[PDB]
């Protein structure tokens, strides 16, 4: 069975960038619901012993009756699990991934400007991702709980821009949430995922 | 130009079903943003005097370069405009539309149960609608700001299930928001839109 992972930090560790109350709802309610529904779909099937990353990457091979729930609930579990691991109370812009971002975008600010533009223009619910595509870095968005793995791209950083991720503190001000996020990126984790994928 | 319509009631008129703070953000920020961006797209173009119902029903005829903004921001203006008008602090379950709902679904409760199931299973951002389709009533969902007019169905009642519509009071408990909504439906306005469409 899939399990709700513990947060790597206290619920208030990301203040004042993400509020404690949002971390509690987001993890204990939203993410938990995706795990519950994913397990209800795969329990007693071949997919109960398939890796989450493999079923997301190969969603087209998931049996038709199960595919929407694996896409939505499996995507929810995969995306939130990644999200908690790429946040940290002490974000420092260090690691090979920063050199390779600078190499691709010229400056870290040019990278952040593209990421923020894509995150702020995403219409409805979804995610903004930094991915590795055949050894090259790209920023992409996905709707709802869709994940770039399904399109053959490995995610190493994601921002959740579902309104539940930011509404209690920021309400409509998604751009202020985006600005806050740079203060709490776990670049140690992003670099680990990059070095494994590149 | 398109204009942000005034609410037909005080911002606190729908308490304790929808909180005043949500009415303020939802109307004064979210709806206003759709009006601003729709006007930025259409002002000074050959669409600057076209009605919004006509453009949404005929998105294919909207020029490719303006279509996403008309769909998303035009949808946002159309949808929220309808929404404010079908809420009321003085809801009474009577009218031709209520009689015809009871005739079609058997009971009003069976209608509400279907509507609630569609509203609570809608994945991501969107709306739940009561529509007229060739003189018959149907419940349909749309994603984001899409509208059933594009598919040739006239909307007479909509529930906004974007998270901004309910997160401040209800957080993840979308079903409690759906329960609250029945207490504030303007069945007189719904009946007007029904008589005009059936
Ligand atoms: Mn989320
Ligand atoms: Mn809305």
Residue numbers in the entry:
A (entry chain B), B (entry chain A): 2 to 199
Q: Which statements did the authors publish about this structure?
A:
We recently established that a Mn/Fe SOD from the bacterium Staphylococcus aureus exhibits equal activity with either manganese or iron.
Remarkably, the chemical differences between the sidechains of these residues are minor, with Gly (MnSOD) and Leu (camSOD) at position 159, and Leu (MnSOD) and Phe (camSOD) at position 160. This shift in camSOD metal preference resulted in a highly manganese-specific enzyme (CR = 0.016). The camSOD triple mutant (Ile19Phe-Leu159Gly-Phe160Leu) had increased activity with both metals relative to the double mutant (camSOD Leu159Gly-Phe160Leu). These studies demonstrate that positions 159 and 160 are important in regulating the reactivity of the metal cofactor. Strikingly, mutations at these positions produced profound effects on metal specificity, yet did so with essentially no changes to the protein backbone structure, at least within the resolution of the crystal structures. These differences are inverted in the double mutants in both assays, which correlates with the inversion of manganese-dependent activity in these variants. The double mutation in MnSOD resulted in an altered electronic structure and re-tuning of the manganese reduction potential to more closely match that of camSOD and more catalytically active with iron, whereas the camSOD mutations altered reduction potential to make it more similar to MnSOD and more catalytically active with manganese.
